[PDB]
Amino acid sequence: REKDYVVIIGSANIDVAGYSHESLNYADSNPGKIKFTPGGVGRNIAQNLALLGNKAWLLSAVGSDFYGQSLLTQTNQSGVYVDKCLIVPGENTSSYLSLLDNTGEMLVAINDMNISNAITAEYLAQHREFIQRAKVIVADCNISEEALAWILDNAANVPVFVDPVSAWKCVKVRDRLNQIHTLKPNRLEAETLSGIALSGRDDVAKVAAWFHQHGLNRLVLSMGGDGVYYSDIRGENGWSAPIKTNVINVTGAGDAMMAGLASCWVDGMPFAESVRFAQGCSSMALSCEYTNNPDLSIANVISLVEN
Predict the structure, then answer these.
(1) Which residues of 49-86 are buried (b: 16+ CB within 10 A; e: fewer)?
(2) Residue 131 and residue 224: Cα distance in Å, rounded?
(3) Count of alpha carbons within 13 Å of 248, Cβ hemisphere only?
(4) In sequence order, what are the residues at sequence separation of 6 or more whose Cβ sits closer than 8 angstroms to the Cβ of residue 98?
(5) In which domain, by residue range, is 13 found?
(6) How many domains does the chain have?
(7) Is residue 122 part of a domain?
(8) Alpha carbon distance 287, 67 (integer Å)
(9) Within the chain, how many helices (H) and strands (E) appear?
């Protein structure tokens, strides 16, 4: 419907990748290739939702600098309503700086995302009504614990899909699983939240049971090569095997899978078929050079799912 919209609350970075032609010399500038790229879990998801054809609003933070503005403009071009983002007066627009090499092997990476704290409970309270009238809310764990707590406490029965981002950033949700509609952790993040070791496929049953005891409505557990384990507090659980994917750039896989899950839910699709669709979406970001695959569409993922 034409007034169904999805609200995404997370971070937006500029992803600076540079590699050296030939070999690192440390004797100043080594001529190579450098790429500026839009990124950040929240912003990445917002874009993938737009590409799947939802009206997606980004609630996020960028700096008063230029390039900050450029990130917003670029995202607008991809379909994302950026109208409501904070433009923080004179702060560094967040960015992830990595130093791949001629192999494509990430060597070392810096990470400057303190502007995430600008995304405050008081900033979000200014959009209470607008947030509470979305079909679904997607939140990443880059934002503060007070911000995420504000969201979960003011969702007004809108389902909140939560992206745990990393082992360190995910602990935020441990005490509020009973407010999260769908949580999408990988193996280490599920180990970190539950305190239960995830040695293999044999261990997911007890990890999921732990999650449901603590209130989690839905679990979507990525176990890498083992595929994806999904579990509903009402009883439905299963495994869905990974899609054979020609892996080009592993970044943006989880951002596509979150988008796929929220989009299918808004669409009316049942849980398991939603997990398979989202696996397809992720498979599409994976075989793309970029963090967000510009060909991600409903028609293109549906064809991937059968083939």
Answers:
(1) bbbbebbbbbbbbbbeeeebeebbebbeebbbbbeebb
(2) 33
(3) 12
(4) 15, 16, 17, 18, 106, 107, 108, 109, 110
(5) 6-306
(6) 1
(7) yes
(8) 28
(9) 10, 14
Tokens of 260: 């796929």
Give the pair of three-digit tokens for residue 216. Answer: 């989690």
CATH code, 17:
3.40.1190.20
Tokens 């239960």 locate to 196
Segments of the chain assigned E as strands = 5-9, 13-20, 32-39, 55-59, 61-63, 86-88, 95-98, 109-112, 136-140, 160-163, 182-183, 218-222, 228-232, 237-240
Q: How was this structure determined?
A: X-ray
- Angstrom resolution of this structure: 2.3
Tokens of 113: 């995302």
186-223: string of b/e by CB count within 10 Å (b at 16+)? bbebbbbbbebebeeeebbeebbebbbeeebbbbbbbb
Residue 1 in domain:
no
- Domain membership of residue 46 (yes or no) is yes
Breaks in the chain follow which residues, C to N over 2.5 Å? none
Structure tokens at 32: 């190579």
Q: How many whole angstroms separate alpha carbon 277 and alpha carbon 256?
A: 10
d(CA 82, CA 72): 6
Q: Do you know the residue count of the chain?
A: 307
